[PDB]
């Protein structure tokens, strides 16, 4: 839980942009803003806050480096050439973060659904899927693998797919579908 080393701008909803843009030539996304309701897990040395190195204290099939083009399957793959010339692909949020990451030594973000609530995501703070973000940047290329980490699992700079310590959690969530 930190506090000073967490000062950047929060952007607005997509639609807000869509709106503000039609009235002024000016289009805003060309600023170091982190998309609302999303947090980066990188303190090393919820705007931003420290987190456990990793965690063995529970199940945890790790997530394959996004770059080493490996198959996690239940997930989303976002490519983003930081120089045009090649079409981006994936999901909108994927792309957004992809760029926010690379431009700041940061590689992991967690998006707590708007629904409910330091970081005690476990028994109590459980019951429904969450969104995960792992990012890697070799050259102008950038790739992001995002997936769903059950509501009660922890949150670590370690990229892992968890199972379900709070046997209460869901099966398949809106985000999760389409993921292959």
């Amino acid at each position: 839980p930190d506090e000073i080393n967490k000062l950047i701008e929060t952007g607005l909803n997509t639609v807000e942009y869509f709106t503000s843009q039609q009235v002024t030539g000016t289009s805003s996304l060309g600023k170091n803003t982190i998309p609302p309701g999303v947090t980066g897990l990188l303190t090393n040395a919820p705007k931003i806050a420290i987190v456990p190195a990793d965690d063995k204290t529970v199940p945890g099939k790790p997530i394959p480096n996004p770059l080493l083009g490996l198959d996690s399957t239940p997930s989303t793959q976002t490519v983003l050439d930081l120089s045009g010339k090649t079409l981006p692909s994936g999901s909108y949020k994927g792309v957004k973060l992809a760029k926010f990451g690379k431009e700041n030594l940061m590689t992991r973000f967690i998006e707590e659904p708007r629904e409910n609530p330091d970081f005690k995501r476990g028994r109590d703070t459980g019951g429904f899927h969450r969104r995960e973000y792992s990012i890697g940047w070799v050259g102008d290329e950038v790739k992001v693998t995002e997936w769903c980490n059950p509501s009660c699992s922890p949150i670590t700079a370690a990229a892992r797919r968890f199972e379900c310590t709070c046997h209460q959690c869901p099966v398949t969530c809106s985000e999760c579908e389409r993921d292959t």
Binding site: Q22, V23, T24, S27, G37, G84, P88, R114, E115
Partner: protein, 1140 residues
């Protein structure tokens, strides 16, 4: 392998900037206005601004300041384009010539650099020794103001403070002092710097001040007398003068942000501040002489003046008259009362000028069905909300103008049987008349024997047998020419007064209540041929004779008052021939029979402002292909009048028009004028074949202009509009709107002011509870803004807000369309929305409502659901092709009356723009460019066909023809993709190449098929093909059309010839300006000919003309390879300027 043409149909109206000074002459006060690509120069005088010169730049005026360097008699203009095209200009006028000359020019673009936020800053030292340009980060480029820096070469210094906000040199200082505000982690510091041209670097400012206002936004540098710089923040102001530090926080600022300024005094005394929401402030720093040393500033304070337009630019002129350049509203001229009027408003509206932008959406429509589309556009933003109606109009050359406040009808006489030109004009006012004699070209008030003037005339003119006739409330009166005296006077048997009266050379008909008498005109007498009574009171008559007839009408048109009929009576008997019912609650108010091309028509016209017209055949005396249109809101009055060699009507009203037959079909041409109450032809000799018009304030004579220009009609909304559609059956429009409301502990949000949505007839809220599941945002409680979106149904004719359907809290409307689905015969208003919340990065919830304007109000028929925003939808072959976020769904309209998913496409980063031709769908992405989808009938689903492979941040998009797709992105450029024709591979078909690039300089918001020029399309060979209009944030409206390969080279060649002979207003190369340019690449230009250039050809001297066809040739489309002088191009250019 693709060719298009692009002309501007309307210069940009939004005002990017404005500056005052002495540019034209040392003794003249000037006002320079930057539109975008245009520069308007005015001159203060008294009532307003006098246009002196208006040039168009080849770039986006990014900076525009003036300076007075000792040596030059007057001021000079520094203008820096957005493509970093710098330059200085002088104003030279030698008689009939006025040139703005380039006294230097270059390009201050560095190949490296990082485009600072806060944009391009352009400043100048009061010592006028050099200019300063904060272009990229940490690099304050400097330019030497030496009288020989014609290339403008400049050096570039370093900055150890990357994030800078505002910068401005400081006055009265031995060495150029540069003050600015910069941000870092520890906050926003505000320091200074000394600059030297020899050492070519910074030395060190006289002071500094580590921690200052959290939200400092403007560095206001004060002149000689006081000195120092003021810092405007978001809630507190601070002034420094080296060793001076004050501060004040008037709660008046708390409300909103200040966004512009202007010093009112040649020395820090009084200033002007612009509020981000309309407010207008006046900040004064009450000076203070010590006791004998010098001047020291005492206390400063901010006091509210009132409300203006949303002031982008701000500039004081004279007598307390401030000019307010709005960018999302109408700019304006204001009076600064020193004597607070009612409601204590120091501000007082003087005058305003049209501002179409930002055009956020628009539809092409032809209400009259005459084959001439008009433009209704959702214009403007917040408070400046509005709709605009762009229509092609006719004008009037205004020969003369009197100041008559009360004309209630006017007629043209003829003093003597000898001369054939009028020489008189009778002007009726309320309880009286007045005869006017045209002494050649003058106006003196005579008197005429036979007539009265203590009564109010209803008619008067030259009847048969050298006699004049005056019908008034009291009686009709006959008079003589040569002898000139009263020679006969009818009258209502019992002193009753005439209510309605008709007349003409030979006959006369007048009404008295229901009583309707008929008189014939003979030698020294008014013979009373007949009399009759109608069931209801009469309200209009017209006995205009027709056919080959000899002045005698067999008929009498008429319109009555409770039954609301409009029949044609046979004269001698008043027998009935044709009785036509119409109206409902509004009566006829003006009528008139007439022959247009050779066909006779009868034209009644309600008090509504409606206008019926039938194909009245004189022979049988009956009418018969009943048509109808609407012209105004006030009861018009028809009046016939002849043109060059043809005849035609003239509908006087709030919206003046001019009926006539263009081709066995009626045509209406709103006259580019405001009100036009009464009118008559005027054939004086001093005024040849003219017209006489009277509004409520003035009588004016003049001839018809007849050179389409564009007329703009505006309907305020006081709340921002986002989309609009046209319902061809409910005769009303669809407009998604949106108002901003504040926070009030009570239970919540209250408005900010009335508006389209809060003040309408019917008005329902959404009772739909599909999201009542939870919905719990914990940021509502303390003052805040919150968009409330409504659907406004608007009346086609009156533009009154009929019904106002509100939406679910925190819900935004963003789609809209009027169509018919499946086998369902109705016609609905289908909306597309999204549930928006700041804590979310995007919407997960949204819906597709389906309405119907049954009558008086809406009625939610269908109501499907979906996860995420519905960025755009559109009627696709009966089916309903909408699109949510990454998804592109197709829907069906069952017999049960429901919409059910039926096909999808998820391969898009964000689908924002749709378009529908056949079974072809053109999709535009936020950044993934365009894609050509397709509906496979049999397959029952989607199939990508092609797609641009270049990353493009689409802004709008359109389908021109089967094979070409037009797109426009945030880069400010246009491009055209085309399905490859190398049908060799089945993969080289997955690609479509950008076969056209052009740099518009405008941020297009909407495109759309439709023209503004009278079409007359049967099979008519046109030089250009297709027609697409497009809206722009800057109010600019433009047009795009396709070309014959054969016409491209000529025009492309011609374009080139012109760029060599034409001086540029900054010595900027047209090839450069129009170069496709993004932060990424910078290709040239292609498949695009900007017609703006190819039109400046008709405005340059004839000598230069030939100096262009100079060896020019031409060969395909037509048989040639030989030269061609001007009179060839002129033909083409001219003939080509007809499509807009």
């Amino acid at each position: 392998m693709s060719y298009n043409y692009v002309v501007t149909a309307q210069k940009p109206t939004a005002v990017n900037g404005c500056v005052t000074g002495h540019f034209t002459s040392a003794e003249d006060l000037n006002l320079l206005i930057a539109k975008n690509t245009r520069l308007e120069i005015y001159v203060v005088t008294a009532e307003g601004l006098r246009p002196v010169k208006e040039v168009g730049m080849y770039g986006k005026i990014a900076v525009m300041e003036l300076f007075r360097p000792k040596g030059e008699s007057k001021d000079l203009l520094f203008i820096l384009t957005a493509k970093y095209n710098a330059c200085i200009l002088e104003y030279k006028q030698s008689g009939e010539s006025i040139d703005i000359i380039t006294r230097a020019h270059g390009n201050v673009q560095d190949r490296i650099g990082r485009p600072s936020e806060t944009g391009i800053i352009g400043i100048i030292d009061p010592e006028c020794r050099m200019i300063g340009l904060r272009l990229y980060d940490g690099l304050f480029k400097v330019i030497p103001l030496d009288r020989d820096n014609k290339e403008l070469k400049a050096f570039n210094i370093r900055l150890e403070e990357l994030h800078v906000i505002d910068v401005k040199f400081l006055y009265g200082c031995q060495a150029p002092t540069i003050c600015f505000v910069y941000q870092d982690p520890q906050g926003r510091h505000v320091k200074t710097y000394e600059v030297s041209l020899r050492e070519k670097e910074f030395n060190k400012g006289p002071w500094k001040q580590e921690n200052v206002e959290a939200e400092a936004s403007m560095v206001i540098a004060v002149p000689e007398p006081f000195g120092g710089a003021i810092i405007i923040g978001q809630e507190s102001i601070t002034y420094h003068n080296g060793d001076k530090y004050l501060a004040i926080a008037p709660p008046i600022i708390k409300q909103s942000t200040i966004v512009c300024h202007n010093r009112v005094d040649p020395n820090g005394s009084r200033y002007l501040l612009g509020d981000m929401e309309g407010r207008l402030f006046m900040l004064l720093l009450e000076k203070e002489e010590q006791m004998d040393g010098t001047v020291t500033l005492k206390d400063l304070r901010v006091e509210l003046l009132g409300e203006t337009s949303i002031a982008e630019c701000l500039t004081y002129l004279d007598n307390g008259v401030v000019f307010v350049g709005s960018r999302l509203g109408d700019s304006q001229l204001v009076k600064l009362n020193v004597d607070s009027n009612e409601q204590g408003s120091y501000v007082v509206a003087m005058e305003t000028f049209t501002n179409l932008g930002p055009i956020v959406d628009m539809c092409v429509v032809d209400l009259e069905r005459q084959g001439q589309g008009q433009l209704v556009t959702c214009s403007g933003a917040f408070k400046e909300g509005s709709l605009r109606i762009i229509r092609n109009g006719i004008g009037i050359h205004e020969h003369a103008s009197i100041d008559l406040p009360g004309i209630k009808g006017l007629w043209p006489l003829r003093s003597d049987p000898n001369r054939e030109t009028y020489d008189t004009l009778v002007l009726s006012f309320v309880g009286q008349t007045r005869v006017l004699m045209l002494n050649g070209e003058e106006v003196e008030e005579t008197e005429l024997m036979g007539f009265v003037d203590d009564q109010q005339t209803f008619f008067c003119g030259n009847v048969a047998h050298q006699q004049l006739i005056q019908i008034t409330s009291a009686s009709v009166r006959l008079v003589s020419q040569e002898p000139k005296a009263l020679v006969s006077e009818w009258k209502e048997p019992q002193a009753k007064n005439i209510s309605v009266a008709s007349c003409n050379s030979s006959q006369v008909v007048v009404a008295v209540g229901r009583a309707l008498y008929y008189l014939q005109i003979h030698p020294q007498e008014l013979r009373q041929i007949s009399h009759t009574e109608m069931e209801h009171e009469v309200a209009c008559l017209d006995i205009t004779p027709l056919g080959d007839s000899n002045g005698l009408s067999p008929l009498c048109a008429i319109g009555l008052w409770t039954d609301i009929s409009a029949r044609i009576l046979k004269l001698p008997s008043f027998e009935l021939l044709h009785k036509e019912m119409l109206g409902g609650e509004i009566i006829p108010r003006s009528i008139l029979m007439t022959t247009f091309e050779s066909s006779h028509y009868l034209l009644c016209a309600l008090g509504d402002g409606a206008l019926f017209y039938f194909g009245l055949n004189i022979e049988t005396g009956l009418l018969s292909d009943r048509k109808k249109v609407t012209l105004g809101t006030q009861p018009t009055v028809l009046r016939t009048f002849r043109s060059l060699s043809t005849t035609n009507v003239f509908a006087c009203s709030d919206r003046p028009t001019v009926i006539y037959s263009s081709n066995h079909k009626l045509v209406f041409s709103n006259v580019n004028l405001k009100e036009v109450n009464y009118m008559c032809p005027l054939n004086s000799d001093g005024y040849p074949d003219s017209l006489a018009l009277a509004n409520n304030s003035t009588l004016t004579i003049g001839t018809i202009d007849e050179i389409q220009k564009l007329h703009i009609r505006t309907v305020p909304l006081y709340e921002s509009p986002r989309k609009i559609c046209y319902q061809e059956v409910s005769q009303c429009f669809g407009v998604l709107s949106s108002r901003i409301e504040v926070q009030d502990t009570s239970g919540g949000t209250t408005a900010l002011r009335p508006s389209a949505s809060t003040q309408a007839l019917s008005s329902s809220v959404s009772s739909s509870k599909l999201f009542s599941s939870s919905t719990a945002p914990h940021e509502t409680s303390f003052g805040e803004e919150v968009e409330v979106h409504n659907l406004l149904i608007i009346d086609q004719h009156t533009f009154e807000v009929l019904h106002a359907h509100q939406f679910l809290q925190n819900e935004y409307a963003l789609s809209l369309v009027s169509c018919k689905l499946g086998k369902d015969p109705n016609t609905y208003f289908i909306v597309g929305t999204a549930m928006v919340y700041p804590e979310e990065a995007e919407p997960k919830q949204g819906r597709i409502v389906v309405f119907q304007y049954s009558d008086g109000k809406l009625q939610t028929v269908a109501e499907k659901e979906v996860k995420g925003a519905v960025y755009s939808m559109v009627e696709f072959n009966g089916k309903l092709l909408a699109s949510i976020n990454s998804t592109v769904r197709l829907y069906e309209w069952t017999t049960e009356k429901d919409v059910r998913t039926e096909c999808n496409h998820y391969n898009n980063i964000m689908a924002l723009y749709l378009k529908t031709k056949g079974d072809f769908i053109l999709v535009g992405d936020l950044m993934r460019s365009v894609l050509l989808l397709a509906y496979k009938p049999m397959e029952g689903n989607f199939e990508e066909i092609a797609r641009d492979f270049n990353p493009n941040w689409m802004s709008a998009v359109e389908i021109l023809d089967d094979d070409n797709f037009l797109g426009a992105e945030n880069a400010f450029n246009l491009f055209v993709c085309q399905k490859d024709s190398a049908a060799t591979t089945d993969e080289e078909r997955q690609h479509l190449q950008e076969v056209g690039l052009f740099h518009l300089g405008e941020f297009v918001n909407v495109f759309c098929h439709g023209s503004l020029v009278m079409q007359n399309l049967g099979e008519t060979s046109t030089p250009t093909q297709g027609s697409v209009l497009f809206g722009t944030v800057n109010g600019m409206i433009g047009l795009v059309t396709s070309l014959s390969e054969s016409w491209y080279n000529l025009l492309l060649d011609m374009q080139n010839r012109l760029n060599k002979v034409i001086k540029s207003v900054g010595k900027i190369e047209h090839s450069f300006w129009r170069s496709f340019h993004t932060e990424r690449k910078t290709e040239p230009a292609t498949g695009f000919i900007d017609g703006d250039l190819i039109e400046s050809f008709l405005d340059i001297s004839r000598p230069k003309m030939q100096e262009v066809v100079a060896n020019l040739q031409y060969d395909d489309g037509s048989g040639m390879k030989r030269e061609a002088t001007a009179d060839d191009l002129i033909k083409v250019v001219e003939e080509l300027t007809r499509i807009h």
